[PDB]
Amino acid sequence: HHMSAIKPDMKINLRMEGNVNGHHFVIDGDGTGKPFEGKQSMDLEVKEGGPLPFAFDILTTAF
Amino acid sequence: SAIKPDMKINLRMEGNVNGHHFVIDGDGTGKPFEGKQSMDLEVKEGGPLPFAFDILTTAF
Amino acid sequence: HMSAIKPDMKINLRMEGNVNGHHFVIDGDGTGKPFEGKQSMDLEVKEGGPLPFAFDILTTAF
Amino acid sequence: SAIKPDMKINLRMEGNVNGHHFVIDGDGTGKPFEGKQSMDLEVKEGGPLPFAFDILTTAF
Amino acid sequence: NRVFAEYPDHIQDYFKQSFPKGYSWERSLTFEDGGICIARNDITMEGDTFYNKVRFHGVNFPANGPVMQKKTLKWEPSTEKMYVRDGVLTGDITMALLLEGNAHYRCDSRTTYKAKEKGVKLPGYHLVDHCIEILSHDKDYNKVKLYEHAVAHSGLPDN
Amino acid sequence: NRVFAEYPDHIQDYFKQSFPKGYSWERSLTFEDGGICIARNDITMEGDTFYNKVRFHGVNFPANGPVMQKKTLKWEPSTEKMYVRDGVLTGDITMALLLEGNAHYRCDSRTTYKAKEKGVKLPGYHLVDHCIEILSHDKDYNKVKLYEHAVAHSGLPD
Amino acid sequence: NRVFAEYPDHIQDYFKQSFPKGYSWERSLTFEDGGICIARNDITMEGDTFYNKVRFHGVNFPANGPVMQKKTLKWEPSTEKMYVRDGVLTGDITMALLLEGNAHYRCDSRTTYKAKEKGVKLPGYHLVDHCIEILSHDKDYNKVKLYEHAVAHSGLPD
Amino acid sequence: NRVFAEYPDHIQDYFKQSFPKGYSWERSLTFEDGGICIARNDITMEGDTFYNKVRFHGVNFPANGPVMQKKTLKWEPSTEKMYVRDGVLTGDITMALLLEGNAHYRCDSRTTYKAKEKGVKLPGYHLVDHCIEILSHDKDYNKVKLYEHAVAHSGLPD
Ligand SMILES: O=S([O-])[O-]
Ligand SMILES: O=S([O-])[O-]
Ligand SMILES: O=S([O-])[O-]
Ligand SMILES: O=S([O-])[O-]
């Protein structure tokens, strides 16, 4: 076991690239979280392929 | 050897679908080497069946 | 509304079954606390013992 | 037609299996009305592949 | 009963080699709407007659589904894939029932076959084409005339 | 028997509301190595006793799998997902049997629950935590003492 | 590419009717040990040449499994079941890889096929026999020669 | 990112112990109507920031299904079952999307989790409660605010 360097308050950067039913998309993400409290939030922006022709919900567990 | 070109078939199926008990008797004939068979089926108990008879057919 | 479910209940049980071609019968007698979400039961194999398969597969069916 | 008896096939596959990126090019020929085709495949990126090539074959 | 299947000379016929003592099978039917059936048949032989002790159990069929609503027309023709798994001959089938309104209803079938006698040689991988038909029935399906045709083969290009 | 589950006030308790007339369930157990079981139970009540008429059928268990080889140790604690499908209360569970060596053997369970009496109010989506344990058994499992604890809840954040 | 399939007169050939404009397919491959693959192909045509834009993604293959261990020998010959679902031609297949030691490794495949042009007539239910073969390859499979033969039919009796 | 889960002292936290170097996950999502997705995320850390390189691919969603018709409302709270499979930490989830019309749409998830560095201790079987929510969005879902809360536990009795 070692020091994780994980702070109680962390920032989150994210880029998602994907394809659903032939439809390509790029989604950028920026958020914050509390790892030891098990909580996070993120602001997501569709950069390419918007508006998405499918339910956004299917992507959410993958951010 | 043991199997003849023409054979007889006797069958008894007991079952339960969706909580509904049934009994089905079968009598028929077939040609094992030609890969063909036919059977007359009769619902003894549980008639009329409240489900598609088709789901049972590959099990006779 | 009027369920007639008591805080302490007895449980009677009879299981008949067939796994892998092996027929079995199991009788059960136990007690439980419905409102605490708890039960216990003594089970006895009446036919098909000893079972040639893992007893664990049966347990959620009791 | 649009369908000719003897036709050519050009292909590019890009993919990722278990995190391993790859690119594969194909050049082949086939006979549509006979339902036969063959193709020469070449891994351009990600060779040698760390997984069985067979998993890819129906996707060319 | 896979005894009633045309086996060519180049494929081991496990089922005809299982007699006179016979064989048994176990089956699971997994329908696309969550309906699940299990079935068993113990097959014996006396004289010129095959005897079938069949059991069939089905659960979780939706109330408004094609099965409970009796909206099925027929099984489409199918091809069974026969292979050995853990010392046992196994047949997997991608099956489909035709429904009223021309839609299909998918079912995945797995059957395991076991000869009664020891030492019956297991076949190699092969395919068995199937077609099953209700030839006739009364209104309530209390009486049904059933027919099946089956042919074993090696698949393309040897079929 | 899901009457033995602790239901909080804010969640409809379909099972205690099913009595005194009772309820039935049907279940499929799909194991990762192709073994498949179906089970049924008709649950009635007479005075202070529940009566359980249970049937259990299992097919296609491999000869050298953990079931026929008796390599299982216990069911791990689980969470049943309760919801309505086609007007019927349905429970789905991701289950796992602990095996010798601390490996796991997966089983997917689906149960459908049906009250005997018509017009029993169906609950909304909820979770039921489960833990089942063989407390004791003799060598060949001819005699077994079984225990279960179940608590219904709404999941996070509560 | 199902354009390379011998179709008899009594079965609608969706794939040959999809050209010159072309068609696309999407596929899932579900292996019995949890490995899952998705794939797509965009098929177009110019003169006597088909062009294929193919994408292939696979996850959850275990390190000790026959795929990552490279213990496969070939796909066994198969039969694809072709049918319409939600207005789209769909193919389901019970597939198997032959492994070293003559065991088999099962894969379930579903493909959806969509013509680019509007108004291409959907076929009725039919079967397509397949066989696929790596004819030759170098040591590391950096170079592979592949072959496929496919025939559409109505099944028994004919 | 399972680093955002509250882990109690008695359960090994594979995810927090994977840092500073990080970890990756692969996932399959199998929907009840044949829609299948795969996803990957490679997670790193620099200073006070986690970085996520995510890929997502989905196929075979029917045209009139809830996904292509955008008829989903939310993921219901769930419980991930965490265990070691073929030497790799794996999470299986029975998931449900609430639809318009109060129906549910089922999805089975399997995630495999792999630390980038050697020496990361593997946990015993445990459970992780999840709840995920779109807090706000614009009309076309071009902009979305997402929130998650996760807590690891040992299940009943507690
Ligand atoms: O449908 S077949 O059995 O003629
Ligand atoms: O596993 S529980 O019943 O202690
Ligand atoms: O396997 S066949 O394509 O020769
Ligand atoms: O749904 S939860 O994330 O508040």
Longest dimension (CA), chain E: 49
Strand pairing report for E72-75 and E49-59? unpaired
In a domain, F54, yes or no: yes
Structurally, chain G folds into a number of domains equal to 1
In a domain, E87, yes or no: yes
Q: Does ligand 1 lie within 6 Å of residue E73's CB atom?
A: no
Strand pairing report for G88-99 and H143-153? unpaired
Residue E154 CA to residue E93 CA, distance in Å, equals: 16
Residue H38 CA to residue A27 CA, distance in Å, equals: 16
Structure tokens at E48: 């010129």
Residue G79 CA to residue E81 CA, distance in Å, equals: 9
Whether residue F47 contacts residue F41, with contact meaning beta carbons closer than 8 Å, is answered with: no
Structure tokens at F47: 């005075």
Structure tokens at H6: 């509250």
C-alpha gyration radius of chain B? 14
Give DSSP secondary structure letters for G55-119.
EEEEE---TTSTTTTT-EEEEPPEEEEEEEETTEEEEEEEEEEEETTS-EEEEEEEEEEEESSTT
Instruction: Give G4 to chain E, closest Cα distance, Å.
Output: 14
Residues 6 or more apart in contact with residue H158 via CB below 8 angstroms: none
- Whether chain H has a CB inside 8 Å of the CB on D18: the answer is yes
E35: three-class secondary structure by DSSP: coil
Nearest by CB to residue F34, choosing from E34, E64, E110, is: E110
- CA closest to H119 among chain A residues: A1
What residues does D13 pair with on adjacent strands? D24, G54
**Residue D40: C-alpha distances to residues D10, D29, D30, D51 (Å):** 10, 9, 12, 19
Q: For chain F, what is the HEC assignment? A: CCCCCECCCCCCCCCCCCCCCCEEEEEEEEECCCCEEEEEEEEEEECCEEEEEEEEEEECCCCCCCCCCCCEEEECCEEEEEEEECCEEEEEEEEEEEEHHHCEEEEEEEEEEEECCCCCCCCCCEEEEEEEEEEEECCCCCEEEEEEEEEEECCCCC
A60: three-class secondary structure by DSSP: helix
- Any idea which ligand is nearest the CA of G150? 3
Residue H88 CA to residue H96 CA, distance in Å, equals: 25
Atom of ligand 4 nearest to the CA of H74: 1
Atom of ligand 2 nearest to the CA of F77: 1
C-alpha gyration radius of chain C? 14
Whether residue G83 contacts residue G100, with contact meaning beta carbons closer than 8 Å, is answered with: no
In a domain, G9, yes or no: no
Whether residue F29 contacts residue C58, with contact meaning beta carbons closer than 8 Å, is answered with: no
**Residue A56 backbone phi and psi in degrees, to 5:** -60, -30
Q: Count CB-CB contacts under 10 A for residue B4.
A: 12
Structure tokens at G53: 């834009």
Burial category of E154 from C-beta neighbours within 10 Å (exposed 0-12, middle 13-18, buried 19 and up):
middle
Distance of CA H16 to the CA centre of its chain: 16
Collect all residues of chain A within an 8 Å Cβ-Cβ radius of residue G24.
22
Per-position b or e across E36-75, b if 16+ CB within 10 A of its CB: bbbbbbebbbeeeebebebbbbbbbbbeebbbbbebbbeb
Contact check, Cβ <8 Å, G26/A19 = no
Residue A8 carries which side chain, given as an amino acid letter?
P
Strand pairing report for H49-59 and H36-46? antiparallel
Burial category of G113 from C-beta neighbours within 10 Å (exposed 0-12, middle 13-18, buried 19 and up):
buried
C15: three-class secondary structure by DSSP: strand
Residue E31 CA to residue E104 CA, distance in Å, equals: 11
Strand pairing report for G36-46 and G23-31? antiparallel
Burial category of B38 from C-beta neighbours within 10 Å (exposed 0-12, middle 13-18, buried 19 and up):
middle
Distance of CA C16 to the CA centre of its chain: 11
In a domain, F4, yes or no: no
Instruction: Spell out where A1-63 has E strands.
Output: 10-20, 23-34, 39-48
In a domain, F105, yes or no: yes
Whether residue C34 contacts residue F50, with contact meaning beta carbons closer than 8 Å, is answered with: no
Residues 6 or more apart in contact with residue A47 via CB below 8 angstroms: A26, A27, A28
Q: Which domains does chain D have, with CATH numbers?
A: 7-59 (3.30.1300.40)
Closest CA to G79 of G91, G96, G93: G93
Structure tokens at F61: 């268990």
The angstrom resolution of this structure is 2.0
Residue E144 CA to residue E74 CA, distance in Å, equals: 13
What residues does C16 pair with on adjacent strands? C25, F55
Number of alpha carbons in the 13 Å side-chain half-sphere of residue E158: 12
Residue H112 CA to residue H28 CA, distance in Å, equals: 9
Structure tokens at F23: 């309820």
Per-position b or e across G5-28, b if 16+ CB within 10 A of its CB: bbbeeebbbbbbbbbeebbbbbbb
Closest CA to C11 of C54, C49, C43, C48: C43
Residue D13 CA to residue G42 CA, distance in Å, equals: 11
In a domain, E26, yes or no: yes
- Whether chain F has a CB inside 8 Å of the CB on B58: the answer is no
Closest CA to F46 of C10, C38, C35: C10
- Whether chain H has a CB inside 8 Å of the CB on D10: the answer is no
Q: Count CB-CB contacts under 10 A for residue H61.
A: 25
Q: Could you check whether the bond before residue D48 is cis, i.e. omega within 30 degrees of 0?
A: yes
Residue H37 CA to residue H59 CA, distance in Å, equals: 6
Q: Does ligand 3 lie within 6 Å of residue G98's CB atom?
A: no
Domain containing G30 equals 16-153
Closest CA to F125 of H94, D15, H110: H94
Number of alpha carbons in the 13 Å side-chain half-sphere of residue A13: 8
Residue G152 CA to residue G156 CA, distance in Å, equals: 13
Closest CA to C57 of E28, E34, G33, F106: F106
Whether residue D32 contacts residue D10, with contact meaning beta carbons closer than 8 Å, is answered with: no
Residue E142 CA to residue G111 CA, distance in Å, equals: 39
Ligand 3 center to E155 CA (angstroms): 10
Residue G43 carries which side chain, given as an amino acid letter?
I
Collect all residues of chain G within an 8 Å Cβ-Cβ radius of residue H63.
86-88
Return the residue matching tokens 């989830």.
H93
Q: For chain H, what is the HEC assignment? A: CCCCCECCCCCCCCCHHHCCCCEEEEEEEEECCCCEEEEEEEEEEECCEEEEEEEEEEECCCCCCCCCCCCEEEECCEEEEEEEECCEEEEEEEEEEEECCCCEEEEEEEEEEEECCCCCCCCCCEEEEEEEEEEEECCCCCEEEEEEEEEEECCCCC
Residue G130 CA to residue G107 CA, distance in Å, equals: 15
CATH of the domain at F111: 2.40.155.10
What residues does B59 pair with on adjacent strands? none
In a domain, E1, yes or no: no
Nearest by CB to residue H87, choosing from G55, G63, G88, is: G63
User: Do chain B and chain D touch with ≥3 beta carbon pairs under 8 Å?
Assistant: no
The conformation of residue G120, written as its DSSP 8-state character, comes to P
Residue D17 CA to residue G56 CA, distance in Å, equals: 8
Residue B58 CA to residue G19 CA, distance in Å, equals: 40
Q: Does ligand 3 lie within 6 Å of residue G4's CB atom?
A: no
In a domain, F65, yes or no: yes
Q: Count CB-CB contacts under 10 A for residue G74.
A: 15
Structure tokens at G73: 């020998």
Contact check, Cβ <8 Å, E59/F26 = yes
Residue G120 carries which side chain, given as an amino acid letter?
V
Closest CA to E60 of B16, B29, C24, A58: B16
Indicate which of H85, H94, H122 best probes the interface with F, i.e. most F CBs within 10 Å of its own CB.
H94
Nearest by CB to residue D55, choosing from G4, G37, G140, is: G37
Whether residue G39 contacts residue G26, with contact meaning beta carbons closer than 8 Å, is answered with: yes
